[PDB]
Give the backbone structure.
Amino acid sequence: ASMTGGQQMGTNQGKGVVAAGDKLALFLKVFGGEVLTAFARTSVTTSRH
Amino acid sequence: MVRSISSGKSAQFPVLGRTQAAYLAPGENLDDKRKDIKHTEKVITIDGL
Amino acid sequence: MVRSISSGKSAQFPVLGRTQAAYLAPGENLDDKRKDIKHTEKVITIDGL
């Protein structure tokens, strides 16, 4: 069937908080380290003339 | 391009805008005419089981 | 694909199925979600002679 009393480590389940959507909210979002440059943009000429 | 994380539920990467130069009149303010890079980020969510 | 057989009148080859995946929502029973891999036989009968 289905299981109850799950002990969800997520979900606010705090005093009087509205019946919360997201069973998974209350988890921090960490950052990867993959900052993106938007490319070198090169050039041209510069010792052509 | 694969990258793997530990712990947290959501992984976010920041991106940057890149700028555009300008001329400066003699005896004139530079700080008066300047635009920031207005860099914004984007995020991918871990999914489920 | 010819192979040789002895004695018996007919010969059957078993044919396996192919699996599909899914999500296990948090706190969901695995059993009800399970669907079987069906495999079905297929028989070559000799005609002689």
